[PDB]
Amino acid sequence: WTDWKDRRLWVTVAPIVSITFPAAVQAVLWWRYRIAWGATLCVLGLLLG
Amino acid sequence: LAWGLLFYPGNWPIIAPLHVPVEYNGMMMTLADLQGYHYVRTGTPEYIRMVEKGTLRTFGKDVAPVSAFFSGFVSILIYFLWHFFGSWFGSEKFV
Amino acid sequence: KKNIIAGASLYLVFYAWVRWYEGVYGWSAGLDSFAPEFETYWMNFLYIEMVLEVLVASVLWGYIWKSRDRKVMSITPREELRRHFTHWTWLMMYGIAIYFGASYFTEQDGTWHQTIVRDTDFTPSHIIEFYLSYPIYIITGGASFLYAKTRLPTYQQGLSLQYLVVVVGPFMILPNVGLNEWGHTFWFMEELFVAPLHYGFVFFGWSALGVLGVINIELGALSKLLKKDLA
Amino acid sequence: HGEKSQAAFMRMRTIHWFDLNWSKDQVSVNETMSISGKFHVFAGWPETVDKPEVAFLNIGIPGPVFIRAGSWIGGQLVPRSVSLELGETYEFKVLLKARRPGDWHVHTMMNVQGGGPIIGPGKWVTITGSMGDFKNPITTLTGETIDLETYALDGVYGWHLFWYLLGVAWMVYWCRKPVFIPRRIAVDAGKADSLITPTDKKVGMAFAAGTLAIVAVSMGQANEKYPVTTPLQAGLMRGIKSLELPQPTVSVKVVDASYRVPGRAMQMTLEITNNGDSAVRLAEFNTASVRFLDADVYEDDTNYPDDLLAEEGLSVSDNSPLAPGETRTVDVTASDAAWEVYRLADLIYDPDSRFAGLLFFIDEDGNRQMTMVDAPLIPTFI
Amino acid sequence: HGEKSQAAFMRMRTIHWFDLNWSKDQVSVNETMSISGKFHVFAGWPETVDKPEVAFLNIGIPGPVFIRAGSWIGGQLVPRSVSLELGETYEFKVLLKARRPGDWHVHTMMNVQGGGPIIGPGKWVTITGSMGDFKNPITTLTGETIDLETYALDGVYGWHLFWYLLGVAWMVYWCRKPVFIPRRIAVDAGKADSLITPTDKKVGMAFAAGTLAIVAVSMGQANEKYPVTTPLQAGLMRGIKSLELPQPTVSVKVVDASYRVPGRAMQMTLEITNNGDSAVRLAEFNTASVRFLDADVYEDDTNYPDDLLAEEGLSVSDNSPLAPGETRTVDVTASDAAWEVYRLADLIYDPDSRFAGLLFFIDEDGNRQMTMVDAPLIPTFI
Numbered sequence A: 001w002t003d004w005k006d007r008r009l010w011v012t013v014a015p016i017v018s019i020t021f022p023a024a025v026q027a028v029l030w031w032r033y034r035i036a037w038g039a040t041l042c043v044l045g046l047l048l049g
Numbered sequence B: 001l002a003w004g005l006l007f008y009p010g011n012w013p014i015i016a017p018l019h020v021p022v023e024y025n026g027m028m029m030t031l032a033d034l035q036g037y038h039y040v041r042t043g044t045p046e047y048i049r050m051v052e053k054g055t056l057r058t059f060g061k062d063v064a065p066v067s068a069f070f071s072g073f074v075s076i077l078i079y080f081l082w083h084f085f086g087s088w089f090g091s092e093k094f095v
Numbered sequence C: 001k002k003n004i005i006a007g008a009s010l011y012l013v014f015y016a017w018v019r020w021y022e023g024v025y026g027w028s029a030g031l032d033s034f035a036p037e038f039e040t041y042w043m044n045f046l047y048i049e050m051v052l053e054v055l056v057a058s059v060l061w062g063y064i065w066k067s068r069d070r071k072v073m074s075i076t077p078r079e080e081l082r083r084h085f086t087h088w089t090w091l092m093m094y095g096i097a098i099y100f101g102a103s104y105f106t107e108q109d110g111t112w113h114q115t116i117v118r119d120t121d122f123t124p125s126h127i128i129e130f131y132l133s134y135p136i137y138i139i140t141g142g143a144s145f146l147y148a149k150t151r152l153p154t155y156q157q158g159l160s161l162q163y164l165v166v167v168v169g170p171f172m173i174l175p176n177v178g179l180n181e182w183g184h185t186f187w188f189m190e191e192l193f194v195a196p197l198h199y200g201f202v203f204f205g206w207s208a209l210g211v212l213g214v215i216n217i218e219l220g221a222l223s224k225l226l227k228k229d230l231a
Numbered sequence D, E: 001h002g003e004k005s006q007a008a009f010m011r012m013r014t015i016h017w018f019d020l021n022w023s024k025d026q027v028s029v030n031e032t033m034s035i036s037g038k039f040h041v042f043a044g045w046p047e048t049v050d051k052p053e054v055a056f057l058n059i060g061i062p063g064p065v066f067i068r069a070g071s072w073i074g075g076q077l078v079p080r081s082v083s084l085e086l087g088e089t090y091e092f093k094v095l096l097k098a099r100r101p102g103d104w105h106v107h108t109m110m111n112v113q114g115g116g117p118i119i120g121p122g123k124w125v126t127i128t129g130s131m132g133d134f135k136n137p138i139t140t141l142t143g144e145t146i147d148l149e150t151y152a153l154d155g156v157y158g159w160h161l162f163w164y165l166l167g168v169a170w171m172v173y174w175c176r177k178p179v180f181i182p183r184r185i186a187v188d189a190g191k192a193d194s195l196i197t198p199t200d201k202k203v204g205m206a207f208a209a210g211t212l213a214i215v216a217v218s219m220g221q222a223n224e225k226y227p228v229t230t231p232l233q234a235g236l237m238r239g240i241k242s243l244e245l246p247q248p249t250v251s252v253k254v255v256d257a258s259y260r261v262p263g264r265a266m267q268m269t270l271e272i273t274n275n276g277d278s279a280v281r282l283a284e285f286n287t288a289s290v291r292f293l294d295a296d297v298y299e300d301d302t303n304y305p306d307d308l309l310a311e312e313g314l315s316v317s318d319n320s321p322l323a324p325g326e327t328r329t330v331d332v333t334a335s336d337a338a339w340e341v342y343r344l345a346d347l348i349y350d351p352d353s354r355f356a357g358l359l360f361f362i363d364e365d366g367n368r369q370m371t372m373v374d375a376p377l378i379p380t381f382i
Ligand SMILES: CCCCCC(=O)OC[C@H](COP(=O)(O)OCC[N+](C)(C)C)OC(=O)CCCCC
Pocket: B005, B006, B008, B009, B061, B062, B064, B065, B068, D215, D216, D219, D223, D229
């Protein structure tokens, strides 16, 4: 909801919980295949869904 | 730090139009509050809304930046932890 | 060694059928638990789907009957190369199923509460979410796992650990439905997120990251089936 | 709609909605209807339900088929949450604007933080027309009159589509190059520098610079295009007025109450007094939104939802005009199909077999007094 | 001093300090001054500020430049925390003793547990003399009169110095022996017994015994030198008396309030009644410690801090003697540099654009009535 996108809790929570999967997927899509994306892919999937 | 700090700036151009103030039946409300008021969410009463409400230890306008720096600092640790978590998920061990 | 059952993904037509059945037979004909219209279009649905899912899981999981000597690592890049393609067809099916189960219908159920339906004692967007989609993707994941176990040489060495996580891991949200409906009752919280009652099957989406291990494995016996033919 | 699944004792000992009035039952899109009445907070509140320090006057409907054009409690607009006191009576009113055609059950509910939804009686309202005609005009403190239904939409679409296409282009830059297999072999052999060439790293800078640039220009342009922007408002409204109703001189004491299991009937034994100045008579017993009336004394004239209205559901052993002083004891029997239809008989599964209700008395003139009753309900197994 | 950084709406809708009186503004060391007045707890308390079940009457100063010789609320000493009720008025008094020369801004504040500091208006007080002259004599329940400024100091110094010298001696016993390098080589080779010889281990016993001994002798000697010792006292003081002020018969209803952005002026529209028996007039509007007066009706005589005093800041369209009954509506304009100096105009950044204030009326005789006002403040953008 737009009326929940405030200045204190939204800005605090969204990025924190959002950075989880990008970091995890990056831990093998970088040292196994030097894949530059992987956070972009996570975010593209999240946004599409 | 970047992840934490780029969020609100990256979203502001999208939600700014909905922060124009409005006087509705004598009370002042933003267009976003007016939306939340008009379109009934029978399952989401207003009081569950976890948004900034002001305190005696809060300053007049300092929420957005302070919450983006705190979020960046915590994102540091979150990325740290989930790097190792993901390294584990990449394991090829057999049991 | 593909382009056959990969394009035969009937998941869309079937799921396109429920999204229609939902918006046509559960909008008002399923708003009230009542007794007649509900147990006609939604409870019979539930029973039929449970029995069909149990039987389809018991049947489809017969790759142990088609299993045999799987020394395809001694074979050239023809028989074993062909099996990996089948494995990845299974995995694409599993991906579609996981998408529809954990993303589409889960957030659709999220939409449903915010409108009217308080979870009290039930929801008809629950027959479609916890008892149709989750068992479907569970069946698909188990099928893929068993296929790899019974048909690829590199998997004959005892139950890859990460393959178990992109599997039974996502299975642990089904029994997790006990946490919710109990955290929604005597511990309720009318949200999806702050309510730690939902953190149960938040510890299930993580498990859906075991496709980092299956991919590492399937790109270690396959990297040795393509090395010689570089250019 | 889901009130039927809530604990029977909870539905009976929380909030009592009476004097309800629906201004219409057949509306067209863009038309308005109102719901008015009063509700009385029960002093014998349930223990597991937090006291209503924080409550929100809501509307029960399947999504925004109407829009809440306004809502008042005691004459004040209440867009925020409010505070209530146990034992008080409040007058409320809600103004709806029809938005989506169909037939909808419209309930009046009160969300109580730490408690839950407290659903009042519902009414069937029909909306006719086409949703494409709905208009939600609004004038801002700059005015600037806008249409809240579609305002700012193109901006959302444009910005999200732009950022998405930017992110897709990043992946596309690397997608043309064979991925996975050659990259695995490369780092496995020790050629970790697979496709991270200088030209491939300078593309990263452009993207990173073009990104950090667009954000700043966009912030500036937004500040210049919308010079006035307040934060999301919020905050309790403690100051809410109740109703100064005179104390019901007619005092009723429940000696004992029981209900037949199975069966759709309850039986009270009341000791009534008439400290008032005029002869009174028991007119209606209201509990859990069900209205049991005694046809010989009172009949409904507010189009109360029929499935909740028991015209002759109330049966008093002696409803002879109770005159001044003149204490008396009578056996009341409230029976109706709604006792079983609305799962009120499921009080047997409740870990608290008690009840609460609203007694209404009428004089010779036709005035009404409202008395509160409550006591344990004892299942009499047949 | 830091009140200027607190949320504007919080400063306006919490506690209102009035009838303030400072007994002096120029004190010498060892001299006393008092601060008296009343404060009214606002019933429309902020949601995020816990209700004042636990409050402490404090003093705002940069460290102990004064010492709080005493403090009363309603006549009782309040060294502990206290309880307050929303909507009550209390009389308070504080007694200070000058300790350190300089010029200090002395504020009256109320700490609210779960809330924060609620700072009242400050006054500039000057202390003259030399801090070396400060005396804090006290007589104990044994009496035994002591000087709390330096009492028991030699004991603290002696004991801490003794224990420190004991700990230094332990390290010194081992510091003469070459440390680090030879010790590393020793355990690396397998001579773990580097410098732990029997004589080195018997020194450990002496220290351990000499320590465990001194503690016991010292406990005994303390018990014998101070035979009477109570535990640190503490505990809420719920019983706090308020003020039985007659209900202000003059009733004021705010129709609407707005403020110019930018600008240092606010504008209310009041509907006033005079249910009283004598003709009244609007004298002062007090909000967030700022006092807007109407020179034609009332002028300050309490040396109120000038930077918070607007002698002619209040402007009423019609301040003609409002006689009995005789309802009326007027447009009030409270304007002063302090609106911008004390960051009250920053209500625009507050996620709650509302306000609360204190209206004072005066009769022909000169009596004062105190009415409470509160409503939404609407930024009128110029
Ligand atoms: C990429 C740098 C852009 C900096 C934009 C900015 O300073 O925004 C400040 C805004 C604070 O908004 P506020 O204090 O209300 O003042 C700005 C007024 N508005 C909200 C109307 C734009 O909160 C944030 O966006 C935190 C981001 C910090 C990045 C270093």
